[PDB]
């Protein structure tokens, strides 16, 4: 789905499979967090479905020894003195010592400030202990979390329930057309993108000889040249757009290991899983009712949440009993208008826009004369069309698909291409759709705060700030205090400070809240990037102080007060909203749960040959399953006829379903339901 999804999958630790355990043979003890998992397996990143606990992600600094156990690094403390010597310990090796928590107050020489420090012991015991007892200590505060888990800013303020959803949904992000690095970061976004392998790093130092949208050439210092080709508009495993783009220009000195080009969900070499959106935390006319989301139409007009999606369609021409399937433009009883988008071979041409039902590949199969309906043989005689012994089996666009044909690949047995025995031609058609953000598309943040698009208002309807800039997204207030994920509120504050910039009062010394802050933070320009490392980073004392010294806009006015709220105007009436509203910038991601895929409907269609019931799944054009629990609701209502209608004429009544379709197109009344064919099979099985 995105580079983070690819990097996480390779670092997955699964308990299922041969030699491990069956899913039915796994109690509530194998799945929950173990104290030995500290710094080895993540306690947050794991699916919340039936595979919870059975699949984990390796911790950031963790590694595997040649035996099979997981090692985690530690700084060896000699005699209450922190040393830069680092050694990896196994699980049972860690228990034979005691390790201090990463955030211990340490002298510049290395001595602990307090005699008693929080220390982990064997069997998951935490207690204070003398400074002369600490053998090792943690390398980094984020030593226990995974890569995707470490990408959640202000993670220490979110409960584990929504934090799990925050990391799981980050892997579900969709690569957008253009990508923006988040204003609020954790530092992990850089190494997560480079190590994932979807960017283009420079192997050797040199200068850019020739740069194009197709390839980048680097002239090394010794004299050799290495040229990196760009992966342009390639379909991923899940239909997402894998598109790389150069970053350097002509004649740029670039060092070794530096990102010269970044791919999907990447901005200047950082994981760009979403966009920075101007968010207002307020209910708005019920359109954001429990977890619903309201969007400004600006995100549609400016392709902010627009993403490219590529589907792969395929059909082959085989050898049949009565002849050979041939791919041809000549299709029986089809006008020259439907075939107008086809070339002379019967293939759709590159660049042609195709809706659902359009012909992609025109294939005809010879059907025997002894296989004809009585009406079909009469209908063939009353139209005088002889020599049409072939029927239509052309590759058509599925329901719900639409886009531009971007690539064609043809394989033919005639042209030395090795096909499976019995095949004469193989054609793959690549269709790409440009999907803007639609009503119902599932968005989400980094704190497990998910919701579908409930309403896309015009830009004038959206609540706008004092200087007329309308907000982009309206998140409901009611769905914030329950989930215990204040990290979104804290990110919204720091997100605005990053968007505006700040200047701390330097006169009369450095204020008492910014004493811990680095000197680089005391001044910030608008649209500045910041890092809030997990379990470290910005404290609420420093965050409150930054809202007080936010930079003014171009007019010189400060739009957001010291509390973090601002006065908004109702774009529908004009009256200002009676109270200030928290307004800032939050990183929102477009998840791969789009309504363009998740909408489905069926009047009639294919039926399973054995049970004569409608097919299942959207890909097979199947209908919904009126399950066992759903039948109880009918009976509880007493809706007898609705229940009989569902299980008979609308499902597996072989003659009833056809007589119902005729009764509708005739305007007649619905006939009486017959006997289900599935019940006939039951008796023939009992025999």
């Amino acid at each position: 789905n995105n580079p983070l999804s690819g990097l996480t999958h390779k670092r997955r630790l699964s308990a299922l499979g041969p030699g491990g355990l069956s899913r039915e043979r796994a109690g509530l003890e194998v799945r929950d967090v173990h104290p030995s998992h500290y710094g080895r397996m993540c306690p947050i990143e794991t699916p919340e479905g039936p595979n919870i606990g059975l699949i984990g992600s390796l911790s950031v600094y963790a590694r595997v020894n040649p035996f099979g156990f997981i090692e985690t690094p530690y700084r060896k403390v000699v005699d209450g003195v922190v040393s830069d010597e680092i050694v990896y310990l196994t699980a049972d090796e860690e228990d034979r010592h005691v390790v201090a928590q990463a955030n211990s107050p340490i002298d510049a020489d290395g001595r602990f400030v307090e005699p008693r420090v929080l220390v982990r012991r064997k069997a998951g015991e935490v207690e204070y202990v003398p400074s002369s007892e600490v053998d090792y200590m943690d390398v980094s505060p984020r030593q226990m979390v995974s890569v995707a888990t470490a990408m959640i800013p202000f993670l220490e303020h979110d409960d584990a329930n929504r934090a799990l959803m925050g990391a799981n949904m980050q892997r579900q992000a969709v690569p957008l057309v253009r990508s923006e690095a988040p204003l609020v970061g954790t530092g992990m976004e850089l190494r997560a993108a480079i190590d994932a392998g979807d960017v283009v790093v420079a192997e050797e130092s040199g200068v850019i000889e020739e740069v194009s949208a197709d390839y980048i050439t680097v002239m090394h210092d010794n004299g050799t040249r290495r040229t990196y080709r760009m992966r342009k508009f390639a379909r991923s495993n899940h239909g997402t757009c894998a598109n790389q783009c150069p970053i350097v220009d002509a004649g740029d000195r670039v060092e070794a290991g530096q990102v010269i080009a970044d791919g999907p969900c990447t901005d200047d070499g950082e994981m760009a899983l979403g966009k920075n959106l101007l968010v207002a935390i307020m209910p708005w006319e019920g359109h954001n009712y429990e977890d619903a989301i309201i969007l400004s139409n600006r995100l549609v007009e400016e392709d902010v949440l627009t993403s490219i999606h590529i589907e792969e369609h395929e059909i082959d021409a085989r050898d049949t009993k009565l002849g050979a399937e041939e791919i041809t433009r000549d299709i029986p009883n089809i006008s020259d208008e439907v075939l107008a988008d086809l070339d002379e071979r019967g293939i759709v041409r590159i660049g042609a826009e195709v809706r659902d039902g359009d012909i992609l590949v025109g294939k005809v199969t010879p059907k025997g004369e002894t296989e004809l309906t009585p009406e079909e043989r009469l209908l063939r005689a009353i139209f005088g069309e002889k020599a049409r012994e072939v029927r239509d089996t052309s590759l058509k666009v599925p329901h719900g698909e639409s886009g531009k044909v971007i690539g064609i690949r043809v394989f033919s047995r005639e042209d030395e291409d090795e096909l499976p025995a019995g095949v004469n031609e193989l054609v793959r058609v690549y269709v790409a759709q440009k999907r803007k953000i639609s009503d119902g598309d599932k968005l989400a943040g980094r704190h497990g705060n998910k919701g579908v698009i409930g309403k896309i208002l015009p830009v004038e309807d959206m609540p706008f700030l004092a200087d007329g800039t309308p907000v982009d997204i309206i998140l409901n207030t009611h769905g914030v205090p329950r989930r215990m994920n204040i990290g979104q509120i804290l990110e919204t504050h720091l997100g605005w400070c990053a968007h505006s910039g700040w200047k701390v009062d330097a006169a009369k010394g450095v204020p008492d809240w910014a004493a811990r802050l680095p000197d680089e933070l005391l001044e910030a320009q608008p649209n500045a990037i910041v890092s809030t490392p997990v379990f470290d980073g910005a404290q609420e004392a420093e965050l409150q102080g930054l809202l007080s010294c936010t930079l003014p806009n171009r007019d010189g006015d400060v739009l957001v007060d010291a509390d973090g709220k601002a006065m908004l105007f109702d774009g529908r009436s004009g009256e200002p909203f009676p109270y200030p509203v928290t307004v800032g910038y939050m990183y929102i991601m477009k998840l791969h749960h789009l309504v363009d895929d998740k909408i489905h409907a069926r009047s009639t269609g294919p039926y399973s040959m054995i049970t004569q019931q409608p097919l299942g799944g959207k890909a097979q054009f199947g209908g919904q399953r009126f399950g066992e629990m759903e039948c109880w609701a009918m009976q509880a209502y007493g809706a007898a006829y609705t229940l009989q209608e569902l299980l008979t004429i609308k499902s597996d009544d072989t003659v009833g379903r056809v007589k119902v379709y005729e009764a509708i197109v005739k305007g007649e009344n619905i006939p009486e339901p017959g006997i289900p064919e599935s019940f006939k099979v039951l008796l023939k099985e009992l025999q």
Binding site: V60, Y61, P73, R75, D84, I86, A102, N103, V139, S140, P141, A181, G185, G187, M188, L190, R191, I194, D195, V201, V254, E255, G257, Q258, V259, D268, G269, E270, R516, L517, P518, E520, L521, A524, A528, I529, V530, S531, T532, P533, D536, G537, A538, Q539, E542
Partner: peptide
């Protein structure tokens, strides 16, 4: 500064604890 090793954009970190071992 954060991650001053490959030549990446300068992201400013609210870090009070130094990183002894890189990822």
């Amino acid at each position: 500064s954060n991650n001053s090793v490959p030549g990446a954009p300068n992201r400013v970190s609210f870090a009070k604890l130094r990183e002894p071992l890189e990822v």
